[PDB]
Design a protein around this ligand. Structure first.
Ligand SMILES: CC(=O)c1cc(-c2ccccc2)c2ncccn12
Length: 114
């Protein structure tokens, strides 16, 4: 079934999803739920899509995965007002991921791979 990089990335995704227990980031945002979204946000992303990409083996590196994670958070902070739940939760997730996938963390991981 899986490869080592796929397992690492599924680990990171599970930990990130735990901060969103209601699933606001689980599926794509549509124009029905968010008026005019498709005008304002050109490159949509969500946790469901990221999971599908991991399973299809579309990510070559943690860099590539981290870039989709930050796009998802930036989209939500661009579209939604600061006072909203969606904005506040996107900021919470963004911090968690930057900490979880820091250069310091990945260095330690790379040292344990000898
Ligand atoms: C992630 C996001 O921007 C989002 C999720 C939702 C959302 C809310 C309830 C149920 C499903 C998604 C939403 N609603 C209005 C404006 C923005 N959003």
């Amino acid at each position: 079934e899986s490869t080592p990089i796929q397992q690492l990335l599924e680990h990171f995704l599970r930990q990130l999803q735990r901060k969103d227990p209601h699933g606001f980031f689980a599926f794509p945002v549509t124009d029905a739920i968010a008026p005019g979204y498709s005008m304002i946000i050109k490159h949509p992303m969500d946790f469901g899509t990221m999971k599908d990409k991991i399973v299809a083996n579309e990510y070559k590196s943690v860099t590539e995965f981290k870039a989709d994670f930050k796009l998802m958070c930036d989209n939500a902070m661009t579209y939604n007002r600061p006072d909203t739940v969606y904005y506040k939760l996107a900021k919470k997730i963004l911090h968690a991921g930057f900490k979880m996938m820091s250069k310091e963390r990945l260095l330690a991981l790379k040292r344990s791979m000898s």
